[PDB]
Amino acid sequence: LSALHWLLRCTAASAERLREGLGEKQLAMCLQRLEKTLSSTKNRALLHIAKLEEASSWTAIEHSLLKLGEILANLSNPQLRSQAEQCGTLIRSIKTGFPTVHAVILLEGTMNLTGETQSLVEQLTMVKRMQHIPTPLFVLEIWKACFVGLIESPEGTEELKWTAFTFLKIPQVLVKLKKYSDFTEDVNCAFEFLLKLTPLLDKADQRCNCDCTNFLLQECGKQGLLSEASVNNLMAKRKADREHNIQPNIQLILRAEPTVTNILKTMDADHSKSPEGLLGVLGHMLSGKSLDLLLAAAAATGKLKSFARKFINLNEFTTYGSEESTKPASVRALLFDISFLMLCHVAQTYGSEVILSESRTGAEVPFFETWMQTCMPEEGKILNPDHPCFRPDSTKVESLVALLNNSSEMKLVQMKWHEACLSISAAILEILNAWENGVLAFESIQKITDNIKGKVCSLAVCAVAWLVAHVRMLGLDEREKSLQMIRQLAGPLFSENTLQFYNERVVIMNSILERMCADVLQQTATQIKFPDTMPYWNLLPPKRPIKEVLTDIFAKVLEKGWVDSRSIHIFDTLLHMGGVYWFCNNLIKELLKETRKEHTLRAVELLYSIFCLDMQQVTLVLLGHILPGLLTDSSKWHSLMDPPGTALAKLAVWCALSSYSSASTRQKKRHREDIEDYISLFPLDVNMRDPLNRVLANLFLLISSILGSRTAGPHTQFVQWFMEECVDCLEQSVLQFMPFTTVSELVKVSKVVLAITDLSLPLGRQVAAKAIAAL
Amino acid sequence: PHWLLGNLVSDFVDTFRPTARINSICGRCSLLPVVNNSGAICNSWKLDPATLRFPLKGLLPYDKDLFEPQTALLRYVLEQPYSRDMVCNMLGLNKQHKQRCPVLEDQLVDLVVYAMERSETEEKFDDGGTSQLLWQHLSSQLIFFVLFQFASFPHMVLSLHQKLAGRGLIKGRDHLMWVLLQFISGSIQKNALAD
Amino acid sequence: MDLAYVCEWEKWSKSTHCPSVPLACAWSCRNLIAFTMDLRSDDQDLTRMIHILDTEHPWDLHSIPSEHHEAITCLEWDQSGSRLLSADADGQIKCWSMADHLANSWESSVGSLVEGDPIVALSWLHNGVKLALHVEKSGASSFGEKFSRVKFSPSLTLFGGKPMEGWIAVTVSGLVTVSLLKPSGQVLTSTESLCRLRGRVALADIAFTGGGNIVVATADGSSASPVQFYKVCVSVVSEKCRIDTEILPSLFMRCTTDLNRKDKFPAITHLKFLARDMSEQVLLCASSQTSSIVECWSLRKETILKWRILSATNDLDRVSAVALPKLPISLTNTDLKVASDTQFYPGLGLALAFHDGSVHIVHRLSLQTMAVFYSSVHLKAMQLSWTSLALVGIDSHGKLSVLRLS
Amino acid sequence: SIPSVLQGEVARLDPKFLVNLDPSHCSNNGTVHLICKLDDKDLPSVPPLELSVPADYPAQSPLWIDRQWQYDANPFLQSVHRCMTSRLLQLPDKHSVTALLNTWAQSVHQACLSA
């Protein structure tokens, strides 16, 4: 510190001699020793740890620096003035968009609308702390992602889910960000940032068919993100920029969320046990798009679970019967149909885990939960047709086949509909055996299918579920008969004996049967034409090897700069198909063949969000298999060059931190499938039976071994960068697993990993100055 | 070269590029003779019977085409009438010894599929039109070269099958069958039927 | 039963900081073991070397430096002993042949490539030769009575009685690929999806049938999803390979319909036909983290064709490797009787390694344990011999051991 | 930790040397690094002469990690460097640590007597 002060005084005196003179190379040499001392990382670290013990000499340092800067800036040089500016910046040293927030928001919109907001707030605060993001640009990227995903949404229920996601889930996220962190000024700044983007907002307004920025500003006013004066001048600006009969979906959703709450509170009590009122309200629900609007609002606002509990309890109430006559029982069976079909539609759209009760004290699990558990096809669920669930009795099933062969029932007055729906599988099994022997004609098959599908539509759904399981098990030539059964069960309407609301139940049932049969009718080319409703389904090309799909989608995502919704769905199917290791390895290969700084940083900011499909398993593969294979192989580390290598080290440390601090249904199923012994995989010469701690301990042993060895190459630069962004990215812990020999060795290879880690007590300077000086 | 020598040898051979450039008849790949049946073969047109390459003096770095099999010269000579002894003098065939020369066999097959292509172009605008003349000359030439076992029958037929597989060459299949009939009718009694 | 020798690497073990990989092992008809190991010293190509060990002189281990950029999934000798197929993750099937007819110099000129897709099953095509051993005619004093050919047809006969040689591989996507080697140096490749519903194939296996049909079984590891089956028929459209697939009856697995505690054993870990050319019986191995179940199934007809279970073990340790026999016994009822009376047990055993040291030689038909060998660390790869009197095995260390089974 | 043969060689040195361990560079993974000293009435060459004694001492004779920048900028130091390097060249194979210390001392003495 004193020699730096003497050097500053030498530059001041030599520059004064230069001013009096006007070869004065003394200034050139003085500045050369300034930049040669201060250019080293050792010396600037030593001055920074020298700062603490000698306070107020730094003031004299900077005042001499200011006078030096004046006397040099008056007499500029073609080379020395730039040098003096550089040394001044060194003594003081002692954007673009943010694609990751974009793709995280678009991922949560596409995959789990029904996820809790706290997980999303935790993930977004994480991303804001990893790469240090200002709050206006952060909220701007949230709004831009939401609007872009709304515009790119396919027409149908996905447009409803995206309108509910922007207008109902994102304000709650910003509210919890306001809690968990001067937010109104920042969100107002971000709204002005957004209101500059007139083409985005006009594309959105053409899809919304209204001013959806007006509804946004009134909604953020209601939540309290924005002051009212801000809201009014923003709406004035938006109207001025805008100047150059059916309700739109946003008004329907914003008014339909209070109807979700009030429909909960009024149908707690079965309309004071008036089932005709229930039939009227539920018939208004099955009128076009009203169910979807309620479900989108309830999903975006966290109340889908209570909605499912309410319809399940209604179903349990309407399962059995009482002493009824002909008319009262007709109403009760219709209540069973409406509750069943809406529960199947919920379970097929928003996943099955909102239907589960998650704790049932006592054995009294409802009928629909067990039926969905053991009998309904989902995406990753294939069913055993001769599971014991599909073989309840032999007693009731003969009563049921006699019931279906009697006439148009006439005995709906007491049916115990759960028993009937559980027995249809065995019933149509015996019908199929009778038709395969030949003892039943095709015309009687038509009569039985009409008796099934006519009075109550849920029977067709239960039968078609068992038929789909049974056709999936069969061979190719043996299928031909059973598919005809689906053609009659899923055919157009049987008429003239319908109870009530028949066409709407037919419409919902045709959707459910589409999503049940689609896979089996993909295996053999069979068109049923039930009635787009499956917008992201069957996305892969039929014959092309799957790495070409992966590299093409990643090339397009890099050249755009953000991840689409369709690209998210194909990336999910490839992660499920080729497995985690293949996926993560091929994406990292496609990273490592980039040569530009800009494209490498963008690729990493996208790949973090792509790996957020299953972050935990991807981190285990990444820090356990990919990085030790790149660091240990002697031929591989030429790939660890400067431009891709810094980016890869950033991605590894972001993945490590986000996995430590701590998501899709395929990934939940597959990690429940997975068996591995991480104690055996990483023998290692807190818990330490948690595999991530084991991978991190193994990786830090590898890093210490690389830093300690001879033959420094690009891999040593890699582990330097990894430790430096471990230091910079942390708040304070991933570095709890670092071996203490790394503390010594890292400044033997030189620097910041000391000067940050020490926490700067008076004794802490002594350990700092010991390590930093001693190379 | 080996990865330790590398440039040290490769550049060295590159400095022998001008000497090879002196010792090359320029345009040698595109010079063609006039086929006379007289014998007394000029030794310029002799090819290597193993690989259809020009025989080259030395080990110099010659130009890249001189290391290719000269199929153009051999097809031009086989397409000429009365080029029977000249093809033997080129490929060193001797007729005291039967050998099953393979590159001759492949060139004859490719000549047949070229005739089949050019017959499938039209063959009906001009009645003579060089097509049936080509098929007659193919009959005579291929009879001689399969008869003395310089090429062989069944490898020729199955390679011919692999060339015509899926190419969809059907308008003059009767001519190809006629040529095969010449071979079978010539030599059914000499060989087993499994040929 | 007994341990003949244990061959270990010297000082080249202690793989550090990089985790283990699964190993391959292949015992040829001539006694040459081809196998890969996790050496991991100064290079990862030490996990991409294919060691050839002549079993009479094990000290002399040749080490082919295969140019496989990812880890070698499958090794497979010929129907003779003269070529070796090796396929890794990311495509790249290579066909190693001897150089100058030395068993110490291998070089591959021929191979296939389905880039990016990991090969998960690999097999040579069947050349139509199959013989059966009648043990009850052991004294019959003529070799025609003891060993007799069983009229099997080769997949893809070409212009004569002569089979084409070639391989068929099944990737981790739905893709299957067939490569046919000509008598000339040419090679024809074709890939085609197995069925239209493209899905994960995490485990796969290949058997052949009479009639020249390949039967390929796929599973996606979940053990509550069906083990699907496809019939593949190869043809040459005069010059191009052509693959025709057709779905067969799938099966589900018991221990999922157990209903007491069905959730355990959630991973199918080994799928194996009982022998290639014995396409009607299937051995499956479900496993949890600690325990496992093997099962045998059969296609037998009555739905005409339908997979019914033969037998299953009670509960085991976690099965780490499985070796099926190669001796083609005649398997019918009289020969079962005489091989039980005169205690001939070479063709009736599978070996099951476990995650403790033990190895169980267990019956083919009803999987009851015939013998037990305690290692005194687990076998990560096992292979029985062609006469099935000795089994070779690579451990969870550098150790390679040959056991003799009486 | 430290092999017994190195401990005995250290215990039986001439009191001119004050050998110690090296905690500065990356050690305790490969060889044993030593900065000893020169404490003699005759003037000394730069003191560290960092010596890396590899494991299995009765083989792979230890190598002196060269540091020319300190031995430059001075004629005496350049001369001591030249003569000590030549004396290491003339040293027999499989030399010991005491051999390097003695040849260092005698090379310094030769540089003294020359100038």
Curated annotation (Swiss-Prot), chain A:
Gene Ontology MF term list: nuclear thyroid hormone receptor binding; nuclear vitamin D receptor binding; transcription coactivator activity; transcription coregulator activity
Motif range (LXXLL motif 3): 291-295
UniProt keywords, alphabetically: Activator, Nucleus, Phosphoprotein, Repeat, Transcription, Transcription regulation
Protein origin, superkingdom: Eukaryota
Cysteine-cysteine disulfides: none
Reported tissue expression: Ubiquitous. Abundant in skeletal muscle, heart and placenta.
InterPro entries (UniProt xref): Mediator_Med24
Biological process (GO), any one: somatic stem cell population maintenance
Position of sequence motif LXXLL motif 2: 197-201
UniProt motif (LXXLL motif 1) ranges: 4-8
GO CC list: core mediator complex; mediator complex; nucleoplasm; nucleus
Location in or out of the cell: Nucleus
Name of one Pfam family that matches: Med24_N
Motif (LXXLL motif 4): 400-404
UniProt short sequence motif LXXLL motif 5, positions renumbered to this chain: 627-631
Assembly and interaction partners: Component of the Mediator complex, which is composed of MED1, MED4, MED6, MED7, MED8, MED9, MED10, MED11, MED12, MED13, MED13L, MED14, MED15, MED16, MED17, MED18, MED19, MED20, MED21, MED22, MED23, MED24, MED25, MED26, MED27, MED29, MED30, MED31, CCNC, CDK8 and CDC2L6/CDK11. The MED12, MED13, CCNC and CDK8 subunits form a distinct module termed the CDK8 module. Mediator containing the CDK8 module is less active than Mediator lacking this module in supporting transcriptional activation.
PANTHER family noted in UniProt: MEDIATOR OF RNA POLYMERASE II TRANSCRIPTION SUBUNIT 24
Family as reported in the entry's similarity comment: Belongs to the Mediator complex subunit 24 family.
Protein name, UniProt field: Mediator of RNA polymerase II transcription subunit 24
Source organism of this protein record: Homo sapiens
Swiss-Prot record, chain B:
Disulphide linkage map: none
Domain of life: Eukaryota
Transmembrane intervals: none
Compartments where located: Nucleus
Function according to Swiss-Prot or TrEMBL: Required for transcriptional activation subsequent to the assembly of the pre-initiation complex. Component of the Mediator complex, a coactivator involved in the regulated transcription of nearly all RNA polymerase II-dependent genes. Mediator functions as a bridge to convey information from gene-specific regulatory proteins to the basal RNA polymerase II transcription machinery.
Disease tied to this entry: Intellectual developmental disorder, autosomal recessive 18, with or without epilepsy: A disorder characterized by significantly below average general intellectual functioning associated with impairments in adaptive behavior and manifested during the developmental period.
Subunit-structure text: Interacts with ELK1. Component of the Mediator complex, which is composed of MED1, MED4, MED6, MED7, MED8, MED9, MED10, MED11, MED12, MED13, MED13L, MED14, MED15, MED16, MED17, MED18, MED19, MED20, MED21, MED22, MED23, MED24, MED25, MED26, MED27, MED29, MED30, MED31, CCNC, CDK8 and CDC2L6/CDK11. The MED12, MED13, CCNC and CDK8 subunits form a distinct module termed the CDK8 module. Mediator containing the CDK8 module is less active than Mediator lacking this module in supporting transcriptional activation.
Family from the record: Belongs to the Mediator complex subunit 23 family.
UniProtKB/Swiss-Prot annotation, chain C:
Residue windows of the WD repeats: 9-59, 60-107, 108-153, 154-191, 192-245, 246-302, 303-376, 377-406
Domain of life: Eukaryota
Subcellular location(s) per record: Nucleus
Role played: Component of the Mediator complex, a coactivator involved in the regulated transcription of nearly all RNA polymerase II-dependent genes. Mediator functions as a bridge to convey information from gene-specific regulatory proteins to the basal RNA polymerase II transcription machinery. Mediator is recruited to promoters by direct interactions with regulatory proteins and serves as a scaffold for the assembly of a functional preinitiation complex with RNA polymerase II and the general transcription factors.
Entry similarity comment: Belongs to the Mediator complex subunit 16 family.
Subunit structure: Component of the Mediator complex, which is composed of MED1, MED4, MED6, MED7, MED8, MED9, MED10, MED11, MED12, MED13, MED13L, MED14, MED15, MED16, MED17, MED18, MED19, MED20, MED21, MED22, MED23, MED24, MED25, MED26, MED27, MED29, MED30, MED31, CCNC, CDK8 and CDC2L6/CDK11. The MED12, MED13, CCNC and CDK8 subunits form a distinct module termed the CDK8 module. Mediator containing the CDK8 module is less active than Mediator lacking this module in supporting transcriptional activation.
Protein's name in the database: Mediator of RNA polymerase II transcription subunit 16
Organism: Homo sapiens
Curated annotation (Swiss-Prot), chain D:
Compartments (UniProt record): Cytoplasm; Nucleus
Post-translational modification, as annotated: Ubiquitinated by TRIM11, leading to proteasomal degradation.
Tissue: Expressed in all tissues examined, including heart, brain, lung, spleen, thymus, pancreas, blood leukocyte and placenta. However, the level of expression varied, with highest expression in the placenta and peripheral blood and lowest in the pancreas and kidney.
Expression induction: By 12-O-tetradecanoylphorbol-13-acetate (TPA).
Known partners and oligomeric status: Component of the Mediator complex, which is composed of MED1, MED4, MED6, MED7, MED8, MED9, MED10, MED11, MED12, MED13, MED13L, MED14, MED15, MED16, MED17, MED18, MED19, MED20, MED21, MED22, MED23, MED24, MED25, MED26, MED27, MED29, MED30, MED31, CCNC, CDK8 and CDC2L6/CDK11. The MED12, MED13, CCNC and CDK8 subunits form a distinct module termed the CDK8 module. Mediator containing the CDK8 module is less active than Mediator lacking this module in supporting transcriptional activation.
Family of the protein in this entry: Belongs to the Mediator complex subunit 15 family.
Name listed for the protein in its UniProt record: Mediator of RNA polymerase II transcription subunit 15
The encoding gene: MED15
